[PDB]
Structure formats: structure tokens, C-alpha cells
Amino acid sequence: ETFRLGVLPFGTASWEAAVIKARGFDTANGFTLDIVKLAGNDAARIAFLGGQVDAIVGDLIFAARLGNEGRGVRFSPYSTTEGALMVPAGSPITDLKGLAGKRLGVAGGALDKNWILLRAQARETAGLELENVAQIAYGAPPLLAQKLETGELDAALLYWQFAARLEAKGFKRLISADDVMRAFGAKGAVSLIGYLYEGHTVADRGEVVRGFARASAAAKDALANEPALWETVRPLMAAEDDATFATLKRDFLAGIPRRPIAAERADGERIYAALDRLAGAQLLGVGKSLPPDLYLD
Ligand SMILES: O=C(O)c1cc(C(=O)O)c2c(n1)C(=O)C(=O)c1cc(C(=O)O)[nH]c1-2
Ligand SMILES: [Gd+3]
Ligand SMILES: [Gd+3]
Ligand SMILES: [Gd+3]
What we know:
Layout: E1 2-7, H1 13-23, E2 32-37, H2 41-49, E3 55-59, H3 60-68, E4 74-79, E5 84-88, E6 103-107, H4 113-126, H5 130-133, E7 135-139, H6 141-150, E8 155-158, H7 162-167, E9 171-175, H8 177-184, E10 193-197, H9 199-204, H10 206-225, H11 227-233, H12 242-255, H13 261-279
Parallel strand pairs: 1-2, 1-3, 6-7, 6-8
Antiparallel strand pairs: 3-10, 4-10, 5-8, 5-9
The structure holds pyrroloquinoline quinone (PQQ) and gadolinium ion (3 copies).
């Protein structure tokens, strides 16, 4: 039995995929993991829609959209670490209002989960619509990070893993999406990033799905229990700089999901429902409610 996992080249899923393969955690679960390299999220989402993989990593809001749009997709928590709003070190910007007039890169486009969270936060706290006051530039995270470094952007909302290298190059993480959800009043760590499993794989190859889910949990557990294992996966982390490697490890470990699925489901449902309520409007990208049976039991 082969399980096809689509991965991004700048993503963190490759790290645990490499542990699964090296430690034989796929073999231990009766399957072979096939890592499918996808160039970007757009291509990954099409590979998912085209049935070219058994799973990709993605966000709960996208998963809810696919589900509302008719897909049998299932979501399993991958990480509670998400999002990084990066500004130059020494920036006068201590708040979201200070983004006014700034060239702001936003990874993933106008429907990105981190952008929906940030826009909701700025509406709730400052009654401000960031798309009206900031010069928004959408793009893939690598591009945004490079253009923030070259000075064409003044700030950028990126995937969390981009903070460490930028911190080594003159930038500071002002806020995370985790900071935003704790401001909302979330008490529990919320996984907004998860494995998205194809409905057809869940229906006809459910034990391969469960075997991969077990292999992933075992790989995350190994990384949290065996500091030596990180040095084996370092080549895949783009972390030749020592502070970058340490920061990546710290934030990955902090994001390992450690709550029961029922609690994860209730928190996701409340944050989802809260989005529009905190925003004071129907945020584009967010449905009235989560589609039914979205979470993998
Ligand atoms: O917001 C974030 O911080 C964040 C982090 C990551 C990650 O851990 O690589 C992903 C995403 N978002 C994301 O939205 C996504 O679709 C994704 C795919 C992958 C991957 O490795 O294949 N990582 C991530
Ligand atoms: Gd996605
Ligand atoms: Gd499906
Ligand atoms: Gd096992």
C-alpha cells in the first residue's frame, strides 16, 4: 500500500516525512510513504482536487471551503504554530494600525487563513480594514521574504518558518496567528494547519490513512523526545545558521498537537464562528459554519 503525501519545498511537513521514512514508521504501519514534491500551494491544491495525492498539508479554513464546495476532505491537526507578521528590527510599528501606508506582503492570497485572522483582529481592535489602508502585495512566502529583505516590502505576513531566517537578516516577528487567537480569548492551542486527506482515500483506504496519521504522530513524538534526530533532518530545514536552526526547532516543538480531537474540533468551530463576530462582518473566505464531519475521527 502506497500513501502519496504532497509537500511544499519551503514547508515543514517534509521534516517529519523524512523521519517517517528514515525510522521506518511507514513500514511499522503497513504502508510505504511516497513524498510528492509540489512547487506551491496552488499546484498542491490542484493535485488534491485532481486525486494525484492521498493528502496535502493545509489550513482548516481552506478545508472547510472545499468541504462546503462538495468535497469529502477530512482534516487532522498538524501544528498549532502558524503565521508570522515580520517587520524590520527597530520598526516603529508596535500595533496593526502602524501598517497603514505600508507595503505589506501577504502570503497565500486574499483568502489566506493568517490574513483572515489579522484582518479580523484589526477590525475588532481598531475598527480598521487593513486592505483599505495598507498597500497589499500577495505572493508565495519565499518571494515575499526575499522582497522584504531587499526593501521593496515594509512588512510581510508569512508562514511561521520564515521568521527564523529573517530574524538573522534584520527583521522581527511582531505577531503570530497564535497571538491573534489568544487575543480573541482562545485558551487552548488551536491547530489551523492540518493534514487534508482525500475523501476517496478515507473511504477506500482508511487503514492507510490511519497508518499515516500514526506514523506522523510517532515522528513528531520522536522529534520531541530525541534531540539528536533534528541533526539528521537539518539539511531539509534550510537552517545552516545556528540561531535559525534553534528557532525552527523551538517553534515546531511548541506546535506539536497535544489535545484530543474533540477539544480540537470545538476550538476550531468556535474560532471559525468567532471570525465574523470579532470582525463585525462576513469575512471573505469564511462560511456561515464548518462543513459537517470535516475532522478525521
Ligand atoms: O501559516 C503557517 O505558518 C503555515 C505553516 C506551514 C508549515 O508548517 O510549513 C504550512 C502552512 N502554513 C500552510 O498553509 C500550508 O498549506 C502548508 C503546506 C505545508 C507543507 O509542508 O507541505 N506546510 C504548510
Ligand atoms: Gd492548503
Ligand atoms: Gd476530497
Ligand atoms: Gd504507530
